[PDB]
Design a protein around this motif. Structure first.
Motif, PDB file in Angstrom:
ATOM      1  N   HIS D  54       7.793 -69.533  98.114  1.00  0.00           N
ATOM      2  CA  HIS D  54       6.429 -69.103  98.377  1.00  0.00           C
ATOM      3  C   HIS D  54       6.309 -67.584  98.354  1.00  0.00           C
ATOM      4  CE1 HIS D  54       4.674 -72.966  99.043  1.00  0.00           C
ATOM      5  NE2 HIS D  54       5.498 -73.270 100.029  1.00  0.00           N
ATOM      6  N   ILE D  56       4.406 -65.849 100.418  1.00  0.00           N
ATOM      7  CA  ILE D  56       4.364 -65.403 101.803  1.00  0.00           C
ATOM      8  C   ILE D  56       5.193 -66.377 102.626  1.00  0.00           C
ATOM      9  CG2 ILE D  56       2.900 -65.251 103.840  1.00  0.00           C
ATOM     10  CD1 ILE D  56       0.702 -64.181 101.837  1.00  0.00           C
ATOM     11  N   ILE D  57       6.175 -65.854 103.353  1.00  0.00           N
ATOM     12  CA  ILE D  57       7.074 -66.694 104.133  1.00  0.00           C
ATOM     13  C   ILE D  57       6.823 -66.423 105.612  1.00  0.00           C
ATOM     14  CG2 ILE D  57       9.028 -65.071 104.139  1.00  0.00           C
ATOM     15  CD1 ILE D  57       9.051 -68.945 103.981  1.00  0.00           C
ATOM     16  N   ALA D  58       7.001 -67.450 106.436  1.00  0.00           N
ATOM     17  CA  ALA D  58       6.797 -67.339 107.874  1.00  0.00           C
ATOM     18  C   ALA D  58       8.132 -67.488 108.586  1.00  0.00           C
ATOM     19  CB  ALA D  58       5.810 -68.396 108.370  1.00  0.00           C
ATOM     20  N   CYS D  59       8.443 -66.540 109.464  1.00  0.00           N
ATOM     21  CA  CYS D  59       9.684 -66.561 110.223  1.00  0.00           C
ATOM     22  C   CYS D  59       9.383 -66.573 111.712  1.00  0.00           C
ATOM     23  CB  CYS D  59      10.573 -65.357 109.891  1.00  0.00           C
ATOM     24  SG  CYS D  59      12.247 -65.466 110.589  1.00  0.00           S
ATOM     25  N   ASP D  60      10.089 -67.434 112.443  1.00  0.00           N
ATOM     26  CA  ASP D  60      10.057 -67.432 113.899  1.00  0.00           C
ATOM     27  C   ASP D  60      11.441 -67.232 114.500  1.00  0.00           C
ATOM     28  OD1 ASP D  60      10.949 -69.848 112.966  1.00  0.00           O
ATOM     29  OD2 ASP D  60       9.817 -71.072 114.387  1.00  0.00           O
ATOM     30  N   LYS D  70       6.233 -65.584 115.482  1.00  0.00           N
ATOM     31  CA  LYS D  70       6.336 -65.826 114.051  1.00  0.00           C
ATOM     32  C   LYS D  70       5.500 -64.814 113.282  1.00  0.00           C
ATOM     33  CE  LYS D  70       4.562 -69.424 112.454  1.00  0.00           C
ATOM     34  NZ  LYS D  70       4.295 -70.845 112.108  1.00  0.00           N
ATOM     35  N   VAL D  71       6.093 -64.250 112.234  1.00  0.00           N
ATOM     36  CA  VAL D  71       5.443 -63.249 111.406  1.00  0.00           C
ATOM     37  C   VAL D  71       5.490 -63.715 109.960  1.00  0.00           C
ATOM     38  CG1 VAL D  71       5.807 -61.304 112.927  1.00  0.00           C
ATOM     39  CG2 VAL D  71       7.585 -61.952 111.313  1.00  0.00           C
ATOM     40  N   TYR D  72       4.684 -63.064 109.130  1.00  0.00           N
ATOM     41  CA  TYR D  72       4.546 -63.420 107.728  1.00  0.00           C
ATOM     42  C   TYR D  72       5.011 -62.251 106.876  1.00  0.00           C
ATOM     43  CZ  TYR D  72       1.906 -67.500 109.212  1.00  0.00           C
ATOM     44  OH  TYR D  72       1.523 -68.686 109.792  1.00  0.00           O
ATOM     45  N   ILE D  73       5.942 -62.527 105.970  1.00  0.00           N
ATOM     46  CA  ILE D  73       6.570 -61.524 105.122  1.00  0.00           C
ATOM     47  C   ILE D  73       6.094 -61.763 103.697  1.00  0.00           C
ATOM     48  CG2 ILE D  73       8.734 -60.591 104.234  1.00  0.00           C
ATOM     49  CD1 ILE D  73       8.771 -62.447 107.550  1.00  0.00           C
ATOM     50  N   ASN D  74       5.641 -60.693 103.046  1.00  0.00           N
ATOM     51  CA  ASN D  74       5.103 -60.737 101.692  1.00  0.00           C
ATOM     52  C   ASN D  74       6.223 -60.421 100.707  1.00  0.00           C
ATOM     53  OD1 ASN D  74       3.317 -59.571  99.276  1.00  0.00           O
ATOM     54  ND2 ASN D  74       2.017 -60.815 100.606  1.00  0.00           N
ATOM     55  N   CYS D  84      12.604 -59.802 107.981  1.00  0.00           N
ATOM     56  CA  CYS D  84      11.857 -60.053 109.205  1.00  0.00           C
ATOM     57  C   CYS D  84      12.068 -58.911 110.190  1.00  0.00           C
ATOM     58  CB  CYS D  84      12.290 -61.377 109.833  1.00  0.00           C
ATOM     59  SG  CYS D  84      11.606 -61.689 111.475  1.00  0.00           S
TER      60      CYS D  84
END
Ligand SMILES: CCCCCCCCCCCCCCCCCC(=O)OC[C@H](COP(=O)([O-])OCC[N+](C)(C)C)OC(=O)CCCCCCCCCCCCCCCCC
Ligand SMILES: CCCCCCCCCCCCCCCCCC(=O)OC[C@H](COP(=O)([O-])OCC[N+](C)(C)C)OC(=O)CCCCCCCCCCCCCCCCC
Ligand SMILES: CCCCCCCCCCCCCCCCCC(=O)OC[C@H](COP(=O)([O-])OCC[N+](C)(C)C)OC(=O)CCCCCCCCCCCCCCCCC
Ligand SMILES: CCCCCCCCCCCCCCCCCC(=O)OC[C@H](COP(=O)(O)OCCN)OC(=O)CCCCCCCCCCCCCCCCC
Ligand SMILES: NC(=O)C1=CN([C@@H]2O[C@H](COP(=O)(O)OP(=O)(O)OC[C@H]3O[C@@H](n4cnc5c(N)ncnc54)[C@H](OP(=O)(O)O)[C@@H]3O)[C@@H](O)[C@H]2O)C=CC1
Ligand SMILES: CCCCCCCCCCCCCC(=O)SCCNC(=O)CCNC(=O)[C@@H](O)C(C)(C)COP(=O)(O)O
Ligand code: SF4
Ligand code: SF4
Ligand code: SF4
Ligand SMILES: [Zn+2]
Lengths: 342, 157, 126, 96, 208, 146, 48, 114, 178
Positions: D54, D56-60, D70-74, D84
């Protein structure tokens, strides 16, 4: 200099006085007072100790957190002496006994240990070494300890050429071996003085004055390579001094003129003990050796200390030795001893 | 080594065994931490089983459990009752207040740690340290005074 | 019979219990605190404050903490009025430096200036 | 990893060590200075890059509520992976 | 109805307002202000010389019967002329009510002690004098109760520093616990925890 | 962002030359004693002072009083301003007399021999603000600079 | 922890240590922050 | 410029109160030195009392000097009844405090504090 | 409502049997004998003493003990130098300084906890957004010097490495309440 040795603060407990002092006789009588002054002004005090952690544990509150570093040392271990003096800029030597044990004698204690300490200090690169000898330790004295301290002064000056040699007189204080000794004569019948206590002049000096002098020697720039004489303000005869001690104790006074050779005999009779002796032959010789007049040597005045008189500081020592009848007695109730100009 | 050193060491071990098997606290507490030290005296933990019995007078006391806040009004009394104990006297600080001021470290009327007044042998942390933790401190003190060698250092003198 | 007359400056320094050094050698500052430019809120610029002159903070030998030797380092006093601050400072005997309140200057704002026919205030972006 | 100074004193992960002539090493004489042997810098340098699909990826940080916010990395820059800000795990989008 | 909002009752507010009018018209010589808060608490602010008549009336009146003194304290607001706002919290067990009486003082105007009305005021006024320096007239034994012996200064005043001026430590040279000027290994870090956005528009003061 | 220059290349202890010619750290007493001895050795014209840019008025007046007490008038600054004519005698001769409020109030400005964008960035910003709002006429003698 | 062992991590100690106070292995505090203000070093060449 | 008095209408009555307080302190000092085992003599205590009075001697406001008399009387009572100890009495002498010198060279050599 | 603890209802009169009973109570010490019997019952009960250190007092997963700094499963330290624990610390026992690390992450170069100043209240572990600082249930860490109870970042991380086996398990067991 280094960035961490720069002094900071207002000279309190948490301040930095910028001195890293390794004090070798810190466990004894003068050592607790010099460590107290060092930690009061705020210093990096290294205490190499030999005895129990319980016996040194009264020194644990003399300074702030981490400003006092206790570490084992052995008098026969040059490696341990060097590891004690490795990180320091002032090395203070107060090693001394009033008697001789089967492991250490007067020659070893007053020559070999200070020479080893000074050699390790010079090879480690300290810039200030202070060594406390005794007053009237010139040479060829009538006692073994004074001669040993004189040749120890010679060896210390030969190894470390700019060592500050401090020669105090018979130091009096709360835990001294001088005023408590003369008040401890009260447990016997009379006071056995040689020639009834006359032809023997003494000027005792306060332990806090000696400690302030040592600290001002640590921070004195023009005291390097000098010999100081730490003496009290007034010279007393031994008879009048013991008379004033027993008057302040309010116990009694019966003097006794006893010859010096049999007094040395009973002194070594008390000294032949496995524990700490009450007196020794060397102790009675040091008692009956008169104090010299310091003429050319600088002193507490030149080092920045006003000598507190024995009449002013005598009640914090001798109030322990008085009975309940005379416990609440002031300074003015005892006549001060007559001084002598000579 | 020689025979005398072993004899001195075994006598000294006996001396230290008696000293650590009979240690008596001074009946002295200050605060929260004193409530926890009587919770250690409570039947679950049994300091009496461990051999540790309160005596009120400092003359019959061995270990001084400074348990609570040392104030400026209390510090001379603290030092007085410490000095009136006999010569083999040990000090355990209990809680953050007696350790380093604790929750009143920045107070005008609180001594920042009881080691500014009395020489503290061991420190027990917590606010309050549980009776578990104070029993741990007491056992650590027993081991510490098991470790010392007074007779052996005297013989080496 | 219950009113007396005094003609003095109301000195209570002997009653405050402050040592002589922290009275004579101290300089207080009386001002409205400046608005920090990281935010646009202006609620903190409404009460007058006096602070004290900053003294020496050094590094602890053991841990490296910020050790100090003065008591009046965290002392901040809040006041409703400048003259009240003057009264308190003169009553407590501290010499004071007073900065007048910097009120923001009123300025003309118009959204239509962004779209000017001839002036330079026309903006090229939004 | 841990390294030793010319004075023989080991250096922490912050990078500080006392000097040769610093008097504060008598604090460590006859005792020890302890340093955590596991460094986060090389412990991330051993972490593999998470390869996702993807944009945009989401990391927690893993574990759900046990991790971080959780943040979103482009993941658009092809010359540098997306990291992250909390856990430091790298993420990379697939261009194949 | 609203589970996160504290429920309010207007009956207690009305009774406390009526009693405030009652006290204000009974004692117009000293009563300067009467207010009832949103929390249904009644406050009467009075002149300093009327503390004895106000407390005596509130204790010994049939319709007041405020026979129990809850507390006596002071608040240091050092931006007004009389900086010590002295607060008496009183309880009425007969009518199950609570009242607050406020007065003012500064560093040089003592007020009358109410020990003759309430005996707890003895220790409470000793605390007020020790902490704030407010003297009390006709007190039986006014002295310090909480500070150390020989403590200089009143520590609950605003201008007094939090850590104080002196600390105690044991000195072995003099064998005594002695006081030194304050030096901290770690200084108390002052935190500026004040948001520059207005939180309560109902308390918005007019500009100066 | 230049505040981090106050963390590097800093003078922390007084230094004096050795007998071989190298700078080594010394005490305040020794440094002040050497400087004071040289100052008492030398006379009024032989001693001079020069001041830089980051210097407060207190040190300036202190050095002025010291050199005036040893009868020295060579109190120079490393920044050059014309001395003859009025010079520093009249305060209008060396001062931004119009001030920054006058920057907002003016309508024609003429910059002669300066690069205000880098010499005084906030003064140039005020020039730009007044140019945007009140339509200043800005002119320049100097090099063509953005 | 025989039927339900804890999760294995490569930074958890393989060998436990007891309370190491009053031993050479004990923890000793220090500042973990490097030097902040750097002194100007004079050159090692004389001017004359 | 009109205030309310505490005890004294003018400075003379308050000076009388100061004199009475000094009488009581001077009488108490030998009893304190005898009862608490103090290092000081009777002369040192009376000199310290005189030093404190001369330290407070610059006050000319009747209310302030009345409150000073009140504080001195509480200290006196706290000395009569033994509540202050040997430590509390000897805190007046500052014998463990190294005093800061009053000259500019010493202030410059120690630190940045003026 | 209310009740009386000592006010007796009316009077029990005077009867010959009641007088004999009171005489027996006073003379033969009946309440003293029954107090003796109850203490004898305690003598014949079982003591509540646990065998420390071989038996430990029971605790809960919420227990606040010695502080620790945790790491992620990758091994990276959880702390992001946000100073929220230092802001919330009521005793001001936390000192933090930090800078960007070599890879640009914001990690503490200085995380000191004065555990002689700590009140062991858990505010830091309930304020930490990433579960970095925790209170592991170790209470058996009494020392012999005041210095070694002042914890720095290396000691705290080393303790978090030591106690990670039960800290993670306790957080797993209790985290769903918090
Ligand atoms: C059952 C009831 C009766 C019990 C009687 C006693 C049973 C055991 C008898 C044999 C051992 C007795 C030794 C007790 C020593 C206690 C005091 C002590 O340890 O002092 C240390 C000290 C050590 O002295 P020091 O020379 O190290 O000096 C320490 C003193 N300062 C610090 C002030 C310099 O004394 C001794 O070691 C004395 C040994 C006596 C041996 C007798 C045989
Ligand atoms: C050695 C053998 C074993 C002995 C007993 C050991 C086990 C029991 C121990 C019990 C615990 C004791 C602990 C201490 C208690 C202290 C309190 C206490 O005891 O107080 C005493 C109590 C005190 O009672 P009191 O204090 O409640 O009474 C009130 C008194 N004033 C108002 C003054 C305070 O009782 C006595 O004094 C009674 C003493 C014993 C009397 C015995 C009389 C026996 C019968 C005589 C003959 C009667 C018939 C005559 C002929 C008639 C013919 C028709
Ligand atoms: C002696 C007794 C020692 C303790 C015995 C066990 C205690 C528990 C007994 C049961 C109990 O609780 O009873 C409560 C009961 C008391 O209960 P009560 O307090 O509810 O009273 C009963 C009700 N009225 C008031 C009507 C009497 O005890 C008794 O009835 C007996 C008490 C008196 C007898 C013991 C005291 C006098 C003994 C004199 C001779 C000594 C005996 C021989 C000793 C030889 C060795 C030394
Ligand atoms: C005689 C010389 C030797 C004396 C004993 C020296 C060794 C010693 O002290 O051993 C310790 C041992 C057990 O004691 P401890 O270590 O306290 O046990 C912990 C249990 N939880 O201690 C013992 O087992 C007790 C030893 C008693 C020796 C006799 C004492 C006089 C009777
Ligand atoms: N006391 C006096 O009257 C005067 C003394 N002096 C000198 O001043 C110095 C200090 O005096 P003071 O405190 O009274 O002396 P002490 O009798 O109290 O002993 C001083 C210290 O020397 C240590 N020491 C002695 N022998 C040895 C040894 N063989 N190995 C290791 N340590 C040893 C002792 O340590 P530990 O406790 O471990 O045994 C003690 O801490 C001495 O050199 C003394 O000669 C000078 C003038 C007067
Ligand atoms: C054992 C030792 C313990 C020592 C204890 C010290 C106790 C200290 C008590 C302090 C009491 C006070 O300071 S209250 C008195 C202060 N008031 C004044 O000085 C009034 C103003 N001063 C004067 O008028 C002075 O000139 C004089 C000298 C008091 C009067 O001089 P007149 O002549 O113009
Ligand atoms: S350390 Fe905590 S529990 Fe102990 S006395 Fe202080 S506040 Fe109470
Ligand atoms: S331990 Fe947690 S709360 Fe404290 S600075 Fe680190 S991330 Fe923030
Ligand atoms: S438990 Fe409380 S007092 Fe201790 S470090 Fe955390 S927030 Fe501070
Ligand atoms: Zn993440």
């Amino acid at each position: 200099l280094h960035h961490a040795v720069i002094p900071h603060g207002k000279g309190g407990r948490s301040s930095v006085s910028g001195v890293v002092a390794t004090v070798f006789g810190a466990t004894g009588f003068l050592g607790r007072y010099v460590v107290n002054h060092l930690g009061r002004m705020g210093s990096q005090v290294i205490i190499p100790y030999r005895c129990d952690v319980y016996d040194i544990m009264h020194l644990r509150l003399m300074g702030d957190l981490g400003q006092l570093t206790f570490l084992e040392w052995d008098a026969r271990d040059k490696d341990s002496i060097r590891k004690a003096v490795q990180h320091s800029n002032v090395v203070i030597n107060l090693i001394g006994r009033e008697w001789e044990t089967r492991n250490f004698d007067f020659e070893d204690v007053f020559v070999n240990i200070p020479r080893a300490i000074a050699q390790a200090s010079k090879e480690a690169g300290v810039e200030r070494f202070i060594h406390v000898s005794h007053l009237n330790a010139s040479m060829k004295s009538s006692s073994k300890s004074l001669r040993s301290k004189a040749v120890g002064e010679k060896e210390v000056r030969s190894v470390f050429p700019e060592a500050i040699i401090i020669r105090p007189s018979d130091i009096f204080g709360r835990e001294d071996r001088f005023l408590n000794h003369f008040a401890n004569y009260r447990w016997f019948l009379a006071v056995p003085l040689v020639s009834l206590g006359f032809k023997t002049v003494k000027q005792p000096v306060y332990v806090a004055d000696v400690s302030k002098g040592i600290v001002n020697a640590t921070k004195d720039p023009d005291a390097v390579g000098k010999t100081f004489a730490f003496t009290g303000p007034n010279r007393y005869l031994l008879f009048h001094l013991v008379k004033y001690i027993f008057g302040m104790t309010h116990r009694t006074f019966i003097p006794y003129p006893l010859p010096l050779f049999v007094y040395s005999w009973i002194g070594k009779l008390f000294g032949l003990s496995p524990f700490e002796p009450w007196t020794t032959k060397d102790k009675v010789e040091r008692i009956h050796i008169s104090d010299v007049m310091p003429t050319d040597l600088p002193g507490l005045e030149d080092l920045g200390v006003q000598p507190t008189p024995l009449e002013l500081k005598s009640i914090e020592v001798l109030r322990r030795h008085r009975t309940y009848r005379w416990l609440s007695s002031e300074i003015e109730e005892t006549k001060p001893a007559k001084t002598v100009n000579y | 080594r020689s025979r005398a050193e072993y004899v001195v060491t075994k006598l000294d071990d006996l001396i230290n065994w008696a000293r650590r098997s009979s240690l008596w606290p001074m009946t002295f507490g200050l605060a929260c931490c004193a409530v926890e030290m009587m919770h250690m005296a409570a039947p679950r933990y049994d300091m009496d089983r461990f051999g540790v019995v309160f005596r009120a007078s400092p003359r019959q006391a061995d270990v001084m459990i400074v348990a609570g806040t040392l104030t400026n009004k209390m510090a001379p009394a603290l030092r007085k009752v410490y000095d009136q104990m006999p010569e083999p006297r040990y000090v355990v600080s209990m809680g953050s207040c007696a350790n380093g001021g604790g929750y009143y470290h920045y107070s005008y009327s609180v001594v920042r740690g009881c080691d500014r007044i009395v020489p503290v042998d061991i420190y027990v942390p917590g606010c309050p340290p549980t009776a578990e933790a104070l029993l741990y401190g007491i056992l650590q003190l027993q081991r510490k005074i098991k470790r010392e060698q007074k007779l052996k250092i005297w013989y080496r003198r | 019979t219950q009113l007396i007359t005094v003609d003095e400056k109301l000195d209570i320094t002997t009653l405050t219990g402050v040592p002589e050094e922290h009275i004579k050698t101290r300089k207080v500052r009386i001002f409205v605190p400046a608005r920090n430019n990281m935010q646009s809120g202006v609620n903190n610029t409404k009460k007058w404050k006096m602070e004290f002159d900053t003294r020496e903070r050094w590094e602890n030998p053991l841990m490296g903490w910020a050790s100090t030797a003065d008591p009046l380092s965290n002392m901040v006093l809040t006041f409703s009025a400048k003259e009240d601050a003057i009264a308190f400072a003169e009553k407590n005997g501290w010499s004071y430096d007073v900065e007048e309140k910097k009120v923001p200057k009123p300025k003309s704002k118009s959204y239509g200036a962004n779209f000017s026919w001839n002036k330079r205030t026309r903006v090229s972006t939004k | 990893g841990v390294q030793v100074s010319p004075s023989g004193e080991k250096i922490t992960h912050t990078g500080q060590v006392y000097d040769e002539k610093d008097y504060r090493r008598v604090r460590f004489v006859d005792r020890q200075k302890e340093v955590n042997e596991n460094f986060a810098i090389d412990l991330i340098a051993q972490q593999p890059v998470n390869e996702v699909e993807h944009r945009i990826i989401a990391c927690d940080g893993g574990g759900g509520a046990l991790g971080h916010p959780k943040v979103y990395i482009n993941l658009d820059k092809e010359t540098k992976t997306g990291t992250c800000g909390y856990c430091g795990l790298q993420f990379k989008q697939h261009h194949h | 109805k609203r589970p996160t909002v504290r429920p309010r009752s207007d009956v207690t507010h009305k009774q406390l307002s009526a009693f405030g009018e009652y006290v204000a018209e009974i004692l117009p010589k000293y009563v300067q202000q009467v207010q009832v808060s949103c929390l249904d608490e009644l406050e009467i602010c009075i002149h300093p010389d009327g503390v004895i008549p106000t407390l005596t009336f509130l204790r010994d009146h049939t319709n007041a019967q405020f026979k129990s003194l809850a507390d006596l304290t002071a608040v240091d607001v050092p931006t007004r002329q009389n900086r010590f706002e002295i607060v008496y919290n009183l309880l009425s067990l007969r009518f199950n009510s609570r009242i607050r009486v406020k007065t003012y003082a500064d560093e040089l105007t003592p007020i009358d002690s109410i020990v003759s009305v309430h005996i707890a005021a003895n220790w409470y006024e000793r605390e007020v004098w020790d902490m704030f320096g407010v003297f009390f007239f006709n007190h039986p034994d006014l002295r310090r109760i909480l500070t150390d012996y020989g403590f200089e200064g009143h520590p609950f005043r605003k201008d007094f520093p939090l850590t104080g001026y002196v600390e105690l430590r044991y000195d072995d040279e003099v064998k005594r616990v002695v006081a030194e000027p304050v030096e901290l290994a770690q200084e108390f870090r002052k935190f500026d925890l004040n948001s520059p956005w207005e939180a309560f528009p109902a308390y918005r003061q007019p500009p100066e | 962002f230049a505040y981090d220059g106050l963390k590097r290349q800093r003078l922390t202890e007084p230094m004096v030359r050795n007998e071989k010619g190298l700078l080594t750290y010394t005490s305040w007493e020794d440094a002040l004693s050497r400087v004071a001895g040289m100052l008492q050795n030398f006379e009024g014209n032989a001693v001079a002072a020069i001041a830089g840019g980051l210097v407060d008025a207190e040190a300036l007046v202190a050095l002025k009083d010291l050199l005036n007490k040893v009868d020295s008038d060579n109190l120079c600054t490393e920044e050059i301003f014309p001395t003859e004519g009025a010079g520093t005698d009249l305060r209008s001769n060396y001062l931004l007399n119009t001030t920054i409020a006058g920057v907002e109030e003016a309508d024609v400005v003429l910059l002669v021999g300066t690069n205000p964008r880098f010499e005084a960035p906030l003064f140039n910003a005020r020039i730009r603000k007044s140019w945007l709002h009140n339509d200043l006429k800005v002119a320049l003698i100097g090099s063509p600079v953005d | 922890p025989t039927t339900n062992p804890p999760t294995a991590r490569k930074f958890i100690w393989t060998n436990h240590k007891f309370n190491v106070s009053a031993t050479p292995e004990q923890y000793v505090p220090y500042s973990t922050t490097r030097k902040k203000i750097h002194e100007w070093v004079p050159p090692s060449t004389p001017y004359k | 410029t009109s205030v309310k008095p505490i005890f004294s209408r003018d400075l003379n009555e308050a000076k009388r109160r100061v004199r009475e307080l000094y009488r009581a302190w001077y009488r108490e000092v030998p009893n304190t030195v005898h009862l608490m085992q103090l290092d000081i003599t009777v002369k040192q205590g009376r000199d310290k009392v005189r030093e404190m009075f001369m330290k407070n001697a610059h006050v000319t406001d009747p209310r302030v000097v009345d409150l000073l008399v009140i504080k001195g009387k509480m200290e006196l009572q706290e000395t009569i009844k033994v509540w202050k100890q040997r430590t509390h009495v000897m805190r007046f002498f500052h014998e463990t405090e190294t005093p800061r010198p009053k000259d500019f060279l010493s202030k410059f050599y120690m630190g940045h504090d003026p | 409502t209310y009740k009386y603890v000592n006010k007796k209802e009316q009077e029990s009169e005077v009867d010959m049997k009641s007088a004999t009973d009171n005489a027996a109570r006073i003379l033969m010490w009946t309440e003293l004998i029954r107090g003796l019997g109850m203490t004898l019952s305690y003598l014949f009960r079982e003591p509540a003493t646990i065998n420390y250190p071989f038996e430990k007092g029971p605790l809960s997963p919420r227990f606040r003990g010695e502080h620790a700094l945790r790491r992620y499963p990758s091994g990276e330290e959880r702390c992001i130098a946000c100073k929220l624990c230092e802001a919330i610390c009521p005793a001001q026992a936390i000192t933090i300084e930090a800078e960007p690390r070599a890879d640009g992450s914001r990690r503490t170069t200085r995380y000191d906890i004065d555990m002689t100043k700590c009140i062991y209240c858990g505010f830091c572990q309930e304020a930490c957004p990433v579960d970095a600082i925790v209170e592991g249930p170790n209470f058996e860490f009494s020392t012999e010097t005041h210095e070694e109870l002042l914890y720095n970042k290396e000691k705290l991380l080393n303790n978090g490495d030591k106690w990670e086996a039960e800290i993670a398990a306790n957080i797993q067991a209790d985290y769903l309440y918090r």
